[PDB]
PDB file of C-alpha atoms and ligand atoms in Angstrom:
ATOM      1  CA  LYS G   1     -58.520  41.207 -10.036  1.00  0.00           C
ATOM      2  CA  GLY G   2     -59.481  39.086 -13.065  1.00  0.00           C
ATOM      3  CA  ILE G   3     -60.555  36.236 -10.763  1.00  0.00           C
ATOM      4  CA  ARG G   4     -62.183  33.280 -12.625  1.00  0.00           C
ATOM      5  CA  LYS G   5     -62.562  30.443 -10.081  1.00  0.00           C
ATOM      6  CA  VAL G   6     -62.104  30.440  -6.306  1.00  0.00           C
ATOM      7  CA  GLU G   7     -61.781  27.701  -3.729  1.00  0.00           C
ATOM      8  CA  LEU G   8     -62.535  28.573  -0.112  1.00  0.00           C
ATOM      9  CA  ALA G   9     -61.324  25.951   2.393  1.00  0.00           C
ATOM     10  CA  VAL G  10     -61.930  25.896   6.164  1.00  0.00           C
ATOM     11  CA  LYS G  11     -60.392  23.705   8.867  1.00  0.00           C
ATOM     12  CA  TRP G  12     -60.748  23.234  12.607  1.00  0.00           C
ATOM     13  CA  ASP G  13     -60.106  20.656  15.314  1.00  0.00           C
ATOM     14  CA  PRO G  14     -62.947  18.847  17.103  1.00  0.00           C
ATOM     15  CA  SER G  15     -64.410  19.663  20.485  1.00  0.00           C
ATOM     16  CA  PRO G  16     -63.209  17.493  23.377  1.00  0.00           C
ATOM     17  CA  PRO G  17     -64.993  14.116  23.600  1.00  0.00           C
ATOM     18  CA  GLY G  18     -68.337  14.523  25.345  1.00  0.00           C
ATOM     19  CA  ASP G  19     -68.624  18.264  24.619  1.00  0.00           C
ATOM     20  CA  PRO G  20     -71.035  19.531  21.963  1.00  0.00           C
ATOM     21  CA  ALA G  21     -69.541  19.144  18.487  1.00  0.00           C
ATOM     22  CA  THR G  22     -67.894  22.114  16.796  1.00  0.00           C
ATOM     23  CA  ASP G  23     -69.492  22.576  13.340  1.00  0.00           C
ATOM     24  CA  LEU G  24     -68.441  25.358  10.988  1.00  0.00           C
ATOM     25  CA  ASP G  25     -70.253  25.836   7.689  1.00  0.00           C
ATOM     26  CA  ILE G  26     -69.130  27.733   4.593  1.00  0.00           C
ATOM     27  CA  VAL G  27     -71.860  29.849   3.032  1.00  0.00           C
ATOM     28  CA  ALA G  28     -71.916  31.949  -0.121  1.00  0.00           C
ATOM     29  CA  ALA G  29     -74.420  34.555  -1.258  1.00  0.00           C
ATOM     30  CA  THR G  30     -74.907  36.109  -4.696  1.00  0.00           C
ATOM     31  CA  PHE G  31     -76.257  39.631  -5.293  1.00  0.00           C
ATOM     32  CA  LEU G  32     -77.882  41.254  -8.285  1.00  0.00           C
ATOM     33  CA  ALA G  33     -76.390  44.171 -10.207  1.00  0.00           C
ATOM     34  CA  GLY G  34     -79.386  46.363  -9.231  1.00  0.00           C
ATOM     35  CA  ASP G  35     -78.998  45.698  -5.476  1.00  0.00           C
ATOM     36  CA  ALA G  36     -75.411  44.574  -4.793  1.00  0.00           C
ATOM     37  CA  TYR G  37     -75.512  45.096  -0.997  1.00  0.00           C
ATOM     38  CA  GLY G  38     -79.122  44.045  -0.481  1.00  0.00           C
ATOM     39  CA  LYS G  39     -81.259  40.891  -0.532  1.00  0.00           C
ATOM     40  CA  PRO G  40     -79.281  37.793  -1.540  1.00  0.00           C
ATOM     41  CA  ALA G  41     -80.421  36.396  -4.897  1.00  0.00           C
ATOM     42  CA  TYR G  42     -79.607  32.980  -3.442  1.00  0.00           C
ATOM     43  CA  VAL G  43     -77.368  31.360  -0.911  1.00  0.00           C
ATOM     44  CA  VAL G  44     -75.280  28.174  -1.086  1.00  0.00           C
ATOM     45  CA  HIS G  45     -74.384  25.989   1.873  1.00  0.00           C
ATOM     46  CA  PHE G  46     -74.542  22.323   2.846  1.00  0.00           C
ATOM     47  CA  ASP G  47     -78.358  22.358   2.757  1.00  0.00           C
ATOM     48  CA  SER G  48     -78.871  24.723  -0.184  1.00  0.00           C
ATOM     49  CA  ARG G  49     -77.515  23.950  -3.704  1.00  0.00           C
ATOM     50  CA  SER G  50     -76.891  26.683  -6.241  1.00  0.00           C
ATOM     51  CA  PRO G  51     -79.710  26.904  -8.805  1.00  0.00           C
ATOM     52  CA  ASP G  52     -77.119  27.226 -11.583  1.00  0.00           C
ATOM     53  CA  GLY G  53     -74.355  24.749 -10.402  1.00  0.00           C
ATOM     54  CA  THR G  54     -71.664  27.442 -10.523  1.00  0.00           C
ATOM     55  CA  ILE G  55     -71.051  27.645  -6.744  1.00  0.00           C
ATOM     56  CA  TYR G  56     -70.890  24.360  -4.875  1.00  0.00           C
ATOM     57  CA  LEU G  57     -69.763  22.785  -1.658  1.00  0.00           C
ATOM     58  CA  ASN G  58     -67.146  20.087  -2.412  1.00  0.00           C
ATOM     59  CA  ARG G  59     -67.161  18.598   1.052  1.00  0.00           C
ATOM     60  CA  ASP G  60     -68.407  19.301   4.545  1.00  0.00           C
ATOM     61  CA  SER G  61     -67.790  18.331   8.134  1.00  0.00           C
ATOM     62  CA  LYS G  62     -70.112  18.495  11.128  1.00  0.00           C
ATOM     63  CA  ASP G  63     -67.388  17.990  13.718  1.00  0.00           C
ATOM     64  CA  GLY G  64     -63.978  18.932  12.360  1.00  0.00           C
ATOM     65  CA  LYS G  65     -62.719  15.337  12.720  1.00  0.00           C
ATOM     66  CA  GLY G  66     -60.077  14.867  10.073  1.00  0.00           C
ATOM     67  CA  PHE G  67     -56.673  16.282   9.203  1.00  0.00           C
ATOM     68  CA  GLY G  68     -56.382  18.978   6.545  1.00  0.00           C
ATOM     69  CA  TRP G  69     -59.275  20.933   5.070  1.00  0.00           C
ATOM     70  CA  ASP G  70     -62.634  19.970   6.595  1.00  0.00           C
ATOM     71  CA  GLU G  71     -64.980  21.934   4.349  1.00  0.00           C
ATOM     72  CA  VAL G  72     -64.316  23.266   0.859  1.00  0.00           C
ATOM     73  CA  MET G  73     -66.419  25.353  -1.520  1.00  0.00           C
ATOM     74  CA  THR G  74     -65.829  26.192  -5.162  1.00  0.00           C
ATOM     75  CA  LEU G  75     -67.059  29.397  -6.823  1.00  0.00           C
ATOM     76  CA  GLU G  76     -66.909  29.372 -10.629  1.00  0.00           C
ATOM     77  CA  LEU G  77     -67.202  33.134 -10.780  1.00  0.00           C
ATOM     78  CA  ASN G  78     -66.452  33.320 -14.519  1.00  0.00           C
ATOM     79  CA  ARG G  79     -69.575  31.260 -15.191  1.00  0.00           C
ATOM     80  CA  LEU G  80     -71.963  33.479 -13.185  1.00  0.00           C
ATOM     81  CA  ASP G  81     -74.561  35.196 -15.336  1.00  0.00           C
ATOM     82  CA  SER G  82     -73.901  38.939 -15.697  1.00  0.00           C
ATOM     83  CA  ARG G  83     -77.032  39.712 -13.625  1.00  0.00           C
ATOM     84  CA  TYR G  84     -74.856  38.827 -10.593  1.00  0.00           C
ATOM     85  CA  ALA G  85     -72.443  41.566  -9.671  1.00  0.00           C
ATOM     86  CA  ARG G  86     -71.268  40.578  -6.215  1.00  0.00           C
ATOM     87  CA  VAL G  87     -70.591  37.435  -4.205  1.00  0.00           C
ATOM     88  CA  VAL G  88     -69.935  37.293  -0.467  1.00  0.00           C
ATOM     89  CA  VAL G  89     -68.440  34.282   1.277  1.00  0.00           C
ATOM     90  CA  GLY G  90     -68.643  33.529   4.991  1.00  0.00           C
ATOM     91  CA  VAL G  91     -68.226  31.004   7.741  1.00  0.00           C
ATOM     92  CA  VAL G  92     -70.822  30.319  10.431  1.00  0.00           C
ATOM     93  CA  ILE G  93     -70.401  28.417  13.661  1.00  0.00           C
ATOM     94  CA  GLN G  94     -73.468  26.313  14.411  1.00  0.00           C
ATOM     95  CA  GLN G  95     -75.052  27.464  17.705  1.00  0.00           C
ATOM     96  CA  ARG G  96     -77.911  25.031  18.354  1.00  0.00           C
ATOM     97  CA  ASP G  97     -75.910  22.807  20.762  1.00  0.00           C
ATOM     98  CA  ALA G  98     -73.906  25.547  22.567  1.00  0.00           C
ATOM     99  CA  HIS G  99     -73.065  29.205  22.245  1.00  0.00           C
ATOM    100  CA  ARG G 100     -69.651  29.137  20.551  1.00  0.00           C
ATOM    101  CA  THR G 101     -67.540  31.924  19.137  1.00  0.00           C
ATOM    102  CA  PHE G 102     -64.305  31.683  17.133  1.00  0.00           C
ATOM    103  CA  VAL G 103     -62.168  31.677  20.306  1.00  0.00           C
ATOM    104  CA  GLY G 104     -64.168  28.547  21.320  1.00  0.00           C
ATOM    105  CA  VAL G 105     -63.201  26.781  18.077  1.00  0.00           C
ATOM    106  CA  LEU G 106     -59.905  24.867  18.282  1.00  0.00           C
ATOM    107  CA  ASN G 107     -57.396  25.969  15.657  1.00  0.00           C
ATOM    108  CA  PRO G 108     -59.748  27.371  12.997  1.00  0.00           C
ATOM    109  CA  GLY G 109     -58.258  28.341   9.665  1.00  0.00           C
ATOM    110  CA  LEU G 110     -59.244  29.374   6.194  1.00  0.00           C
ATOM    111  CA  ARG G 111     -57.569  29.559   2.796  1.00  0.00           C
ATOM    112  CA  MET G 112     -58.857  31.065  -0.399  1.00  0.00           C
ATOM    113  CA  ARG G 113     -57.209  30.470  -3.716  1.00  0.00           C
ATOM    114  CA  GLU G 114     -57.585  30.834  -7.438  1.00  0.00           C
ATOM    115  CA  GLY G 115     -56.118  27.748  -9.027  1.00  0.00           C
ATOM    116  CA  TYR G 116     -52.876  27.393  -7.110  1.00  0.00           C
ATOM    117  CA  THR G 117     -52.619  31.105  -6.217  1.00  0.00           C
ATOM    118  CA  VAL G 118     -53.348  31.755  -2.550  1.00  0.00           C
ATOM    119  CA  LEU G 119     -55.514  34.889  -2.218  1.00  0.00           C
ATOM    120  CA  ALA G 120     -56.074  34.911   1.553  1.00  0.00           C
ATOM    121  CA  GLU G 121     -55.382  32.906   4.700  1.00  0.00           C
ATOM    122  CA  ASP G 122     -56.681  33.625   8.180  1.00  0.00           C
ATOM    123  CA  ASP G 123     -56.993  32.122  11.655  1.00  0.00           C
ATOM    124  CA  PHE G 124     -60.127  34.165  12.634  1.00  0.00           C
ATOM    125  CA  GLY G 125     -57.952  35.948  15.235  1.00  0.00           C
ATOM    126  CA  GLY G 126     -59.664  39.271  14.431  1.00  0.00           C
ATOM    127  CA  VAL G 127     -63.184  37.951  15.112  1.00  0.00           C
ATOM    128  CA  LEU G 128     -62.648  35.841  18.249  1.00  0.00           C
ATOM    129  CA  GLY G 129     -65.889  36.949  19.898  1.00  0.00           C
ATOM    130  CA  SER G 130     -68.066  36.350  16.821  1.00  0.00           C
ATOM    131  CA  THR G 131     -70.406  33.459  15.947  1.00  0.00           C
ATOM    132  CA  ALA G 132     -70.049  34.020  12.170  1.00  0.00           C
ATOM    133  CA  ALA G 133     -67.897  36.076   9.812  1.00  0.00           C
ATOM    134  CA  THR G 134     -67.847  37.160   6.219  1.00  0.00           C
ATOM    135  CA  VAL G 135     -64.401  36.287   4.903  1.00  0.00           C
ATOM    136  CA  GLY G 136     -64.258  37.855   1.478  1.00  0.00           C
ATOM    137  CA  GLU G 137     -66.108  39.686  -1.247  1.00  0.00           C
ATOM    138  CA  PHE G 138     -65.925  39.516  -5.081  1.00  0.00           C
ATOM    139  CA  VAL G 139     -67.273  42.352  -7.234  1.00  0.00           C
ATOM    140  CA  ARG G 140     -67.598  42.365 -11.036  1.00  0.00           C
ATOM    141  CA  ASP G 141     -67.140  45.630 -12.943  1.00  0.00           C
ATOM    142  CA  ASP G 142     -68.390  46.714 -16.361  1.00  0.00           C
ATOM    143  CA  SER G 143     -65.267  45.121 -17.914  1.00  0.00           C
ATOM    144  CA  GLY G 144     -66.551  41.726 -16.721  1.00  0.00           C
ATOM    145  CA  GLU G 145     -63.631  41.106 -14.427  1.00  0.00           C
ATOM    146  CA  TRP G 146     -64.043  39.902 -10.863  1.00  0.00           C
ATOM    147  CA  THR G 147     -62.077  41.746  -8.151  1.00  0.00           C
ATOM    148  CA  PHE G 148     -61.408  40.201  -4.728  1.00  0.00           C
ATOM    149  CA  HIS G 149     -61.821  42.512  -1.734  1.00  0.00           C
ATOM    150  CA  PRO G 150     -60.149  40.996   1.332  1.00  0.00           C
ATOM    151  CA  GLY G 151     -61.589  41.522   4.767  1.00  0.00           C
ATOM    152  CA  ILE G 152     -62.912  39.445   7.621  1.00  0.00           C
ATOM    153  CA  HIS G 153     -65.952  40.931   9.400  1.00  0.00           C
ATOM    154  CA  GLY G 154     -67.496  39.464  12.504  1.00  0.00           C
ATOM    155  CA  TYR G 155     -71.192  38.939  13.221  1.00  0.00           C
ATOM    156  CA  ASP G 156     -73.023  37.958  16.420  1.00  0.00           C
ATOM    157  CA  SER G 157     -75.804  36.095  14.597  1.00  0.00           C
ATOM    158  CA  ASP G 158     -76.902  32.492  14.172  1.00  0.00           C
ATOM    159  CA  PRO G 159     -76.603  30.724  10.793  1.00  0.00           C
ATOM    160  CA  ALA G 160     -80.092  31.469   9.490  1.00  0.00           C
ATOM    161  CA  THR G 161     -79.902  35.155  10.323  1.00  0.00           C
ATOM    162  CA  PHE G 162     -76.349  35.492   9.009  1.00  0.00           C
ATOM    163  CA  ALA G 163     -77.389  34.096   5.625  1.00  0.00           C
ATOM    164  CA  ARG G 164     -79.943  36.886   5.254  1.00  0.00           C
ATOM    165  CA  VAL G 165     -77.730  39.786   6.359  1.00  0.00           C
ATOM    166  CA  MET G 166     -74.262  38.790   5.132  1.00  0.00           C
ATOM    167  CA  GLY G 167     -74.481  41.098   2.094  1.00  0.00           C
ATOM    168  CA  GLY G 168     -74.487  44.329   4.130  1.00  0.00           C
ATOM    169  CA  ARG G 169     -71.958  46.971   3.015  1.00  0.00           C
ATOM    170  CA  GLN G 170     -68.786  47.479   5.092  1.00  0.00           C
TER     171      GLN G 170
HETATM  172 CA1   CA X   1     -70.070  22.016   8.676  1.00  0.00          CA
HETATM  173 CA1   CA X   2     -60.163  19.027  11.089  1.00  0.00          CA
END
């Protein structure tokens, strides 16, 4: 693809007053060249900074209150050390307060772009029964160029489990 820098943005509307809050989190995982579909080298989310500052959450929301994009993450893929050959991005729905799948989130949406070029948009309509989803993959070849592989894949897991398994091959 020749992808250099990606922004992943996610939006949703809040739960009704008095219901448990709806909280989606963006998470990214990096994988090593010698194990691209295996154990994450590290993960980035609202409670876990990148060790190298190249992938970072720009803003979060714990309730979806607010017009426009509620949570945004930047991935400076060009700057990743060559040891990293694959990055997976995903969205989890927090489960601690209530079992909630994408159909139970009001008007969820995502957008991924490189600069001003939109790469993907989705409403999670293919994963309505899931509690988390991977929403995109980037793979770097021997030429050094990052390719984006679209695809939304649903998971039935909670956030902590998802972060460990989100690299699995599809
Ligand atoms: Ca959140
Ligand atoms: Ca919102």
